[PDB]
Amino acid sequence: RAKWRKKRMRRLKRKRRKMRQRSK
Amino acid sequence: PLAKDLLHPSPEEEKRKHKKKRLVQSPNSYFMDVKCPGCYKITTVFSHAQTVVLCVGCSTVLCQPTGGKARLTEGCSFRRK
Amino acid sequence: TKKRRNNGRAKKGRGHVQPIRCTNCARCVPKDKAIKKFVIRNIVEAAAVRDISEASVFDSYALPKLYVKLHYCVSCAIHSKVVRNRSREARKDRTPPP
Amino acid sequence: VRMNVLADALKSINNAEKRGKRQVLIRPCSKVIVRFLTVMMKHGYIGEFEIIDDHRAGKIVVNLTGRLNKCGVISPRFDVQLKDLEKWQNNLLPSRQFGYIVLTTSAGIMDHEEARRKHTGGKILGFFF
Amino acid sequence: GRMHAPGKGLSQSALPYRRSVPTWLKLTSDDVKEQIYKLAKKGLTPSQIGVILRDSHGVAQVRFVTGNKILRILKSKGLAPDLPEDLYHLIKKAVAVRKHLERNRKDKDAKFRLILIESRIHRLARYYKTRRVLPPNWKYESSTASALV
Amino acid sequence: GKCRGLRTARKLRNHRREQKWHDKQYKKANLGTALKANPFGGASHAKGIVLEKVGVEAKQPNSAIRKCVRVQLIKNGKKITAFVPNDGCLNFIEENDEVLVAGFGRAGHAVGDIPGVRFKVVKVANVSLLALYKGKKER
RNA sequence: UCGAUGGUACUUUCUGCGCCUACCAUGGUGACCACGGGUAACGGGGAAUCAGGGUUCGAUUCCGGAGAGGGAGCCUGAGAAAC
RNA sequence: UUGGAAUGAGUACACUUUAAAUCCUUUAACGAGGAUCUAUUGGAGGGCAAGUCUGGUGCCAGCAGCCGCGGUAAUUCCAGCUCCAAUAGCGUAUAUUAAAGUUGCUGCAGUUAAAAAGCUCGUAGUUGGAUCUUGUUUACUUUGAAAAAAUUAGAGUGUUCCAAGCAGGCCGCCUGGAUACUUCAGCUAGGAAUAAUGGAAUAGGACUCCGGGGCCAUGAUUAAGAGGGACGGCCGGGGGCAUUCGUAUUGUGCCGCUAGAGGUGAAAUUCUUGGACCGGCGCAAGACGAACCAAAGCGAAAGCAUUUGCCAAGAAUGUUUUCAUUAAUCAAGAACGAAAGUCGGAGGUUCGAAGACGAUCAGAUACCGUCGUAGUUCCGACCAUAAACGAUGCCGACUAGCGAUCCGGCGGCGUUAGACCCGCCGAGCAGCUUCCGGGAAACCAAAGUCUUUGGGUUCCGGGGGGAGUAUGGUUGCAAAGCUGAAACUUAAAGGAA
Numbered sequence A: 001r002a003k004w005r006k007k008r009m010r011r012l013k014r015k016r017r018k019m020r021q022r023s024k
Numbered sequence B: 001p002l003a004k005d006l007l008h009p010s011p012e013e014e015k016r017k018h019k020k021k022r023l024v025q026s027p028n029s030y031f032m033d034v035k036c037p038g039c040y041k042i043t044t045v046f047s048h049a050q051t052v053v054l055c056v057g058c059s060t061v062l063c064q065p066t067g068g069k070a071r072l073t074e075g076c077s078f079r080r081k
Numbered sequence C: 001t002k003k004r005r006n007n008g009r010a011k012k013g014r015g016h017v018q019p020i021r022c023t024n025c026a027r028c029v030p031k032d033k034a035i036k037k038f039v040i041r042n043i044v045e046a047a048a049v050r051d052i053s054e055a056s057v058f059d060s061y062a063l064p065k066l067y068v069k070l071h072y073c074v075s076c077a078i079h080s081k082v083v084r085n086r087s088r089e090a091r092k093d094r095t096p097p098p
Numbered sequence D: 001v002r003m004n005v006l007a008d009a010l011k012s013i014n015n016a017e018k019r020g021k022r023q024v025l026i027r028p029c030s031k032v033i034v035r036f037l038t039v040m041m042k043h044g045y046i047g048e049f050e051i052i053d054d055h056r057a058g059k060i061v062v063n064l065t066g067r068l069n070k071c072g073v074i075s076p077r078f079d080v081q082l083k084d085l086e087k088w089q090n091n092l093l094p095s096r097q098f099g100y101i102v103l104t105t106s107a108g109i110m111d112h113e114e115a116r117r118k119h120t121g122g123k124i125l126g127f128f129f
Numbered sequence E: 001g002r003m004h005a006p007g008k009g010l011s012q013s014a015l016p017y018r019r020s021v022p023t024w025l026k027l028t029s030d031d032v033k034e035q036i037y038k039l040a041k042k043g044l045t046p047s048q049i050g051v052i053l054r055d056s057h058g059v060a061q062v063r064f065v066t067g068n069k070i071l072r073i074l075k076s077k078g079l080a081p082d083l084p085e086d087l088y089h090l091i092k093k094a095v096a097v098r099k100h101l102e103r104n105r106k107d108k109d110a111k112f113r114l115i116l117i118e119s120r121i122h123r124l125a126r127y128y129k130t131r132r133v134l135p136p137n138w139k140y141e142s143s144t145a146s147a148l149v
Numbered sequence F: 001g002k003c004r005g006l007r008t009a010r011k012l013r014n015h016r017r018e019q020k021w022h023d024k025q026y027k028k029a030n031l032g033t034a035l036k037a038n039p040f041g042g043a044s045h046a047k048g049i050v051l052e053k054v055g056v057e058a059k060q061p062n063s064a065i066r067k068c069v070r071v072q073l074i075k076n077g078k079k080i081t082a083f084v085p086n087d088g089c090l091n092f093i094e095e096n097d098e099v100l101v102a103g104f105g106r107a108g109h110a111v112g113d114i115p116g117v118r119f120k121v122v123k124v125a126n127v128s129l130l131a132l133y134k135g136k137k138e139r
Numbered sequence G: 001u002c003g004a005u006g007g008u009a010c011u012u013u014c015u016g017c018g019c020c021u022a023c024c025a026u027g028g029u030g031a032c033c034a035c036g037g038g039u040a041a042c043g044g045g046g047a048a049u050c051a052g053g054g055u056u057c058g059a060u061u062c063c064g065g066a067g068a069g070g071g072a073g074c075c076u077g078a079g080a081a082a083c
Numbered sequence H: 001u002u003g004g005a006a007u008g009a010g011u012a013c014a015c016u017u018u019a020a021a022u023c024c025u026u027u028a029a030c031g032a033g034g035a036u037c038u039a040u041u042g043g044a045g046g047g048c049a050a051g052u053c054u055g056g057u058g059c060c061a062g063c064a065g066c067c068g069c070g071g072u073a074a075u076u077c078c079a080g081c082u083c084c085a086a087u088a089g090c091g092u093a094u095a096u097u098a099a100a101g102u103u104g105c106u107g108c109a110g111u112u113a114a115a116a117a118g119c120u121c122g123u124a125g126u127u128g129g130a131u132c133u134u135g136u137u138u139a140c141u142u143u144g145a146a147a148a149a150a151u152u153a154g155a156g157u158g159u160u161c162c163a164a165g166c167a168g169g170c171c172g173c174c175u176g177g178a179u180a181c182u183u184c185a186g187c188u189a190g191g192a193a194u195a196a197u198g199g200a201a202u203a204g205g206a207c208u209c210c211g212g213g214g215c216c217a218u219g220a221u222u223a224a225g226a227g228g229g230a231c232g233g234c235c236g237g238g239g240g241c242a243u244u245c246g247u248a249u250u251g252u253g254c255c256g257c258u259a260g261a262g263g264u265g266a267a268a269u270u271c272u273u274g275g276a277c278c279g280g281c282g283c284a285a286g287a288c289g290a291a292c293c294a295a296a297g298c299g300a301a302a303g304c305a306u307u308u309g310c311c312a313a314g315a316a317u318g319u320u321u322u323c324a325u326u327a328a329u330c331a332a333g334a335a336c337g338a339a340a341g342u343c344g345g346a347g348g349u350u351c352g353a354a355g356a357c358g359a360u361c362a363g364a365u366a367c368c369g370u371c372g373u374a375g376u377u378c379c380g381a382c383c384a385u386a387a388a389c390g391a392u393g394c395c396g397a398c399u400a401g402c403g404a405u406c407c408g409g410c411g412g413c414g415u416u417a418g419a420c421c422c423g424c425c426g427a428g429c430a431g432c433u434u435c436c437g438g439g440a441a442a443c444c445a446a447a448g449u450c451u452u453u454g455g456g457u458u459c460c461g462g463g464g465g466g467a468g469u470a471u472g473g474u475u476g477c478a479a480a481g482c483u484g485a486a487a488c489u490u491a492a493a494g495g496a497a
Ligand SMILES: [Zn+2]
Pocket: C022, C023, C024, C025, C026, C027, C072, C073, C075, C076, C077
């Protein structure tokens, strides 16, 4: 589904951000 | 109606048309002399007056403003040219 | 493909309408999209109207009726067979059945 | 808003010819329209038109002869020269045997043939054929 | 259509073709000017003067009886307002909405409608400055807007 | 619709200027990308050293072993995988021999049922592969 | 700041000029795209391709400019910041 | 098949050529039957001109730009034969142009194929009604000069023809070595239509007198089926505040009689060891505003329904009122913007994410049931996203008909005490019939007036993926919003029928 794929994307952006702030 | 005459329209259809959509625009309104039964002076009032006109001397009220043609009171004449 | 000109609802020149609940499943359905049906039935059906009339204390007492305005969602109105799917040309018929 | 009056004038004529009308009423009139209808009338594409004075922009009732295929405007009014006049004849006119491109030159409003005979360019108003 | 509305109405007065005084109107050019002056001193705006003359005086159009218009007649005698009437009523309406918007901060419709009224104020005032009707230093501010009214 | 005005030249020129970037063909040939990522760097041919012979599976529905060679370019050190075109010409290609490779036919696109091989062998050991296939040259 | 824009007086140059100096003025530019960045950008006459309209190219024999490994500073002379 | 002819390649006695030569040209001698003095380069399924040919190979090897071919009779591969295409040239790789009306000025698209901002305001920008001699400032057009030659176009001329060259005819002698084009800007001389701009309004007006006079027809186009404003009686679930009512649900006091009630496909969890459920009289709180309620109204959208009062707005209509182009659409910028969410208060009846438990199932972490947190409600501050949809920008014109409907206005039998009836006009939400036309069609009175293409204007789309991802900036308390790629991958994805 295009909405749950959008939800999986936002759950992935939130992980890439926290992984990027750890090494900031 | 492919050959309808636009330059010479019948007067029954020009009065039917809107006052702007006619061949030459003309108002649907007019003036009129109101003679109240109490006095003798006639007053030239507009058909679509929209104001509360009064006779000379404050004898009575001639017409009342409405959404269209003004509503005259009892015993009055109109339709002047 | 646009299956219906009115999009399945009687909303024209209007932004939002208050919703209602289908009688089968209490789901939010717009008031115009709802498949309404005003049913007027007697409290006593024909199978029992004979015994109730002969056991009445009044000489001439007419049995009352149940004025219930039923609302249906599109899904439940079709499972309950109150509206059927019609042919592509028969759908344009807006007259109630006789 | 009506930013071009010659456009709505020729559009009403073109639509009235497609409907088989005998007369068409051009509601807004102007000097450019009357001189445009004259160029079409001198070549026999429209009949006699009667200007109606109403102390305003004015109206025109054009008599349609049925000989007009299409009349249209060219907006904006580009600057047309003599060396560039043959280019517009191939894009707008349906043939090299008929059809005219109306130009507003300093010598007045005329078609492309009269503009070439007078040897003067100008601005393009529209076309008819 | 309307400037700040989706309505496309056609309601407007359509003047007759005859730019001539009817034979039954006995008021001369100077008799009408005297009526315009006595009504202007009473506080009536040029749009309101032409209404009384049209109804209670039979003057269908003062521009046909007199050679000029009402606002031009008042400017010659110096009885014209400092700011034009159409701009005065746009500022008066904006003050009435802004005053209502103070004691009512929950109506976001009046807040949206106030932007429309003040848009016509800055549009109209921009035109009067190009025509040198308003001074170049003139400016509509919501603070002293109630003072001009 | 479009703006047809006498003084709309800048509006039309700037609109077409910014809408041409939406054309992937125009944008590919007007940016720094796709030219440095191209192993040839804008050249039609390039020489390299054969690292190893590799067999590439032909994509479905076809089924075969495409005889290719892993090539390391001399001009920039990039490692690509060319394709030995003709039948049995892989036997002519020795090990660690200089070969001239070119595009496979399409501009940076995989040709045929071969998955990703976008190059092909043209010469080998300064001898053309077409001359070795026809027996008119040796070595 | 340590010239940006203008004014005054020089200085300097083959001469006009913030070219420079001193004293004043607070300017000047910009969505009509300044400033900054990129250019596998020398510019143009031109070339290719083209129904019209265009797209692309122009290191390259002609014209103009620039440089002589990188900058910088000079001699001589009418003429060079010359290789 | 058999024959004599003709010749260039080659070759040189030499001349010529040239500073000296070479080359070409000229020319003795010599130089062709397999005239072996040998034409190759790519192809033969289709696109695309040319084989159901034979042998080998057997999803192998390979061919194939694309679609595809090959799994034991391959017209596609490896080959023989044959044929086809261009030809002293012919293939390949890459860039580029036309093809591409698949970058759009000519000239495309945005209802469903990719697409019109959620909506409105708004500066720059763009574009702007009609009107003034018919019968100053510019833009524009026409003319001249300029725009270096070479190139290009092109005149003349047998370089053997030709690409070229500028030379060459004629029996010293007479002819060429032309012309056109060179955008834009600048210069010049005419035209005055079209499109802008200016002149007299508190006359510090023109011309005349000769500080005051005289004089001018003394100086204000029209009043847009453009717009603003006033006015008139209206109209509307338009907005805000403050009141008011209604039953219901939940909870509770009292009264009544009883063992079951709740719930489900069936059950259980749960409520009742007794006073649940049910009935009565009540009460309290918080929501909500049924039926009336409609393809009806209003509002820029989101959205909007008990009564009454208050507040300031609004369209349409009516107008022989006023202003006189003040307008249209809009980068930047700005107001509003369902629900959910966020923060701080108040309140939490119902419902209910999460969560628990009970069912069902092979498993349910789901659908179903019993609860129930956040939430749902109110106030203030954020958020600014929806299948925010009519999947359809706004303004304006035009091109059919009919019956209804909402508002206002208008004039007509009659009935009723304004209501109804019959028409007309303007405004609006819609409907239908049509071969108006359009479209890929579904369908559309607009999605028409479109190769017979140009009314104005904004935003926006360029095969499908990667991807609304990465990165940078910006906004926010956060969630996230806005802006927004590339490498790489792919021959389809998709619409309607
Ligand atoms: Zn239901």
